[PDB]
Amino acid sequence: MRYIHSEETIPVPENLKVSIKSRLVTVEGPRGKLQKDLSHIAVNFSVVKKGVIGLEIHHGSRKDVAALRTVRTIINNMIIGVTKGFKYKMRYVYAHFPINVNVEKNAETGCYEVEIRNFIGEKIVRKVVMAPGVEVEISKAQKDELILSGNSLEAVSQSAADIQQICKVRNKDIRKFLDGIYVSEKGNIV
Amino acid sequence: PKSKRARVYHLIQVNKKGREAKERLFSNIRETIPKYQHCFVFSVDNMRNNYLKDVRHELNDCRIFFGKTKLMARALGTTPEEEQADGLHRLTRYLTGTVGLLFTNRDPADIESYFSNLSQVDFARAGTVAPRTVTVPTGIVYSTGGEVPPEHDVPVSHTLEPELRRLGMPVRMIKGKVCLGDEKGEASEGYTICKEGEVLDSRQTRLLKLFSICLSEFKVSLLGYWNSASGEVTELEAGKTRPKR
Amino acid sequence: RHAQKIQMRKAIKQHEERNVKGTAKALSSQ
RNA sequence: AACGCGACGAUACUACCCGCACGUUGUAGACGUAUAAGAAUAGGCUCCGGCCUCGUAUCCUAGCAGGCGAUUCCUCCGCCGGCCUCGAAGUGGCCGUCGGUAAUUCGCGUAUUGCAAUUUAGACACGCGCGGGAUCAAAUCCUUUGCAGACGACUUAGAUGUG
RNA sequence: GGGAUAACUGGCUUGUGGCGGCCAAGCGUUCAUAGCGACGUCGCUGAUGUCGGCUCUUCCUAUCAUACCGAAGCAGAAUUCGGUAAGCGUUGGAUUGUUCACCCACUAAUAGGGAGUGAGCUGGACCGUCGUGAGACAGGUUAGUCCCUACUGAUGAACUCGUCGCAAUGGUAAUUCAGCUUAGUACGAGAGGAACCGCUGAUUCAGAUAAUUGGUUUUUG
RNA sequence: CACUGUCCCUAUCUACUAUCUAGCGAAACCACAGCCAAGGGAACGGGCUUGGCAAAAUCAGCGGGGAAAGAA
RNA sequence: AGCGAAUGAACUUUAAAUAUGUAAGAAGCCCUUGUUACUUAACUGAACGUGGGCAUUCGAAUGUAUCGACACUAGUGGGCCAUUUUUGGUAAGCAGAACUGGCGAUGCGGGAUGAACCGAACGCGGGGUUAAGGUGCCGGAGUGGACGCUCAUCAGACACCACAAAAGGCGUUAGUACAUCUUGACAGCAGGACGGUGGCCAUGGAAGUCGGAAUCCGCUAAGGACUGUGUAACAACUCACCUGCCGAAUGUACUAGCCCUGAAAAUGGAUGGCGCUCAAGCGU
RNA sequence: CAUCGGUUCUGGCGGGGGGAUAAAGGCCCAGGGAAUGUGGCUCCUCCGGGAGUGUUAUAGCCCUGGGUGUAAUACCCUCGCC
Known about the structure:
- This is part of a larger assembly, with chains A, B and C.
- In chain A, the strands form four sheets. Chain A has a four-stranded antiparallel sheet with strand order 11-12-7-13, covered by helices on one side. A three-stranded antiparallel sheet of chain A has the order 1-6-5, with helices on one face. In chain A, strands 2-3-4 form a three-stranded antiparallel sheet, with helices on one face.
- Helix content of chain A is 19%, strand content 42%.
- Chain A has two helices and 13 strands, in the order E-E-E-E-E-E-H-E-E-E-E-E-E-H-E.
- Chain C is mainly α.
- Chain C contains two helices and no strands.
- The structure holds five RNA strands.
- It is classed as ribosome.
- Keywords: Ribosome, Ribosome biogenesis, pre-60S ribosome.
């Protein structure tokens, strides 16, 4: 129908500096730096108030206006991770074979790796390399819990999902074999 | 056009009321106005309002109304040209939020004396501050979460176990029995579902209700009343502390 | 999917009628 | 790739190379055959002043098809040397010498091609010329071998040698 | 005896019957009725035998197996149903003689098809005579339509002869089973009974090779 | 009951050819020609359309094409 | 069309569309009178004519590059396809009849190609203008102009039936009808979701939720003798419905375009080819 | 090459006629009306932007009738000239 104007708003907290190039978005704050490229969507970024980012499209369709809603949440997610961060808590359960989980930090390539051993008695080791920017720690607070924390929700949630998919039973009965590692809590560090 | 969410039709016996319920509430208040002497206005701000049935039964002398605030505003009459008695428009000025009406014939002082004397303990409701720090113990969890001593308690149902994990406790089943860490104990610390001086999230309120831990008091605060014979309204310590519109 | 939509619209209409409201086998088998 | 390409060795004749001299020498077609950022296009460039639809731009562009001297100059162009640079199918820069040179100005020539007739002019390649440098080779046949073989073709050995 | 037609099919075919009643959004000569009218629901319901066998290469998927997923009281084991998949494989007996359908053994499995009505080897019709409730005739006549190219190899003129190279393009390759460990473990009342990682062989296919074994002998030794 | 390359599963040896040379030296057959694919209503191409392509001259093998029922 | 004309395709004042038969003057006449074996009660009629005139539009239009009669002579004497009208039948095919057109004896332009399509008919040349068809280029001529629509895991591309439907699409755009909304509609979040009542039979047990039948009342803001999860039965959760907060437009069924699916085998290939996406596709 | 004859293609210029003697439009006159309300106040997270107020004021608009006015111009048809 070619709507003439459509706009949305991203509020910015006082401890942040948001810098936008052509469509490259950089958010700085207490916890670190996040960048992501938005050249695949036609959008006009602007400044409306002291702490408000204005994003507009002109002469777009219903599809192009709706693509403004995904970029508003994506930038707002970068605001949250830079301020408060993200935390995924994962529990691993077993019936007879205890699951040994080992987390080391690689000096080269600068990323954590999680090694899963003894999954329903299997002798294969399962190595999962994490995304750059997510730290994994063994919970010395409850039994059989890992914490995946970081600034990027994309990096934390994908690395958590990689662990689930690497410990998955095959050629068995789902109703009886309940062994696996599962995401228990999702939220913020602060 | 297309790409739309499909509404689910409900194969069930009760349907939306709509216009007929609104005019029925208009008519029922309309015949109630001449029959009684005093119209008391009250608020239950952030209560669960399940004990209003009890104040209905033991106060069979009076007629009690609790519905849409806008509908009771016009039923009494917001404008002074459209009103069924003098001073009703000032009674509509107290109708702001979760506000009810009390059509009574007895003494105004007797109603205030009774509503101050009534007190019931109820569940927390979201957005409240927490008066206590409550904690489920480390080992086997129970029906009340440790409020009653465990020797007089009953173990919690295994049906509740997926719900407790969803609401945030790391709870597992050993030998058909719902427990937090190990069945014997230790191997963890207890789970704190609320802390003192913390606003209660709805997740925490659902956890306190499930163990039947009560942290809030159900009370009815009278804003004011209007006398049919006299014709004006009066306020008592609750109209000052709450915004009116 | 054509047969399911016919069945579900029959279920809607039968419910709407019932909620608003408040021999050949024998001859053969003989 | 038997009509795709690279590196290297030796290249006798002829003429392999250098210089300049001309061709009834041949072209899918010379006539100023002039012009390097990268990147984005819901953004860029900048001397940080500002600028951006626009290459209708910039350079070059005058003189018998285009001299000799003067003043003025280190303006533009070109050839050879030294130092370096240029490998994706390989080149430009700096310095120096020499030569030419309206940037300003000047003296003396053009006629008759007769009122137009391609303005024979460029480039690469191919030849013939001189006068100068340089060079002194291989392959096939034949005999032999059998790691090969229908015939060809292929692996070899035939110059004095561990033949 | 005369007439007409002078073979047929070609965006063909596939998985779900027909009749009758009820319901039925619509349409109609204006529209739930002139009438047409879907989905449902209700009522009724051993074949065979001129047919088979064999055939390289290539392609199709409408997949039997091998690979990977989804679902099932799928405990484990064995499976069943469906999805993506043609990369790779896909036997022999008996069975009246034939095809099978069943039934047996081996196997991972013993899938089905195509090369416009597929393509190759193998196991007659006219008059004449005598009749006609009906045929017969050593009676006559007659029809049987070493070269180019493709492929596989081998040379080759012109670029001076060679030596060492690059790689456009074309082709392309591996397949299945078993045993040891995991482990008599997980799982299971019992009977039973896995899998990942690791290790070692074998079947089929493909490319070489002759130390050894066997075979061959004009070494005419 | 015994043997047997019938087969599993095929290998090897000999003679004459096939090959090359010297001499001698035909015939069959021959409109002109010979790379494919899709289309060319009359299920008919080899000459047309528009694509793939396409490089002299030759030597040996093959078993494909340059061949074929006719309709009651 | 009307039946405020009558009567009732078979009704009509009038009257379509579409083709079709017959006549339109010099051969017709008119006025006077000659014959006849025809005819009449009869100088009455029918045929052929004599004498005058209508000869200047002489009795609609348009055309006319002549038409008629006799005698003689040569080749011919098959159909195929299509439009329209009509007859009969089938699951669908198809079969017959009448007119007309095309081809057979016909070259040329176009549809990539060509028996049956479109344009147009032919001496040898030069110049101009066009038809059908086209202007991304192979290809002469527009990457011409205006407004929209479409993204297809082999779209579509110029003159179309079948598959195929009362068919599936949480693809996209336009429209129609109905409905809800500052008396807070659609969606969410926080709460309520009660009492008689574990309603009645039945079951070892069955409390709304294994079954059979009824399905009422109170409190109401509203809440089913219950829509699902769950228990051995309960409990617990959830839905329907209701209130508070945020905010102004929504949502149901159809219709119309364009797009996806709506079935495909077997040498490698076809909008003619490259290729084309605010087109080089679709409509005007 | 100049001046012509015949056919033809293609630019430019000067007139005439017709519409509603175009419709519009500019500048004046006389009425009427509104809002996507100009100027004037109140509230307003004060580099600013809004909510309410009302018929020309510190901008303007729309409708009707009249004058300049047989106005101009588009379109169509026409007489010509380079």
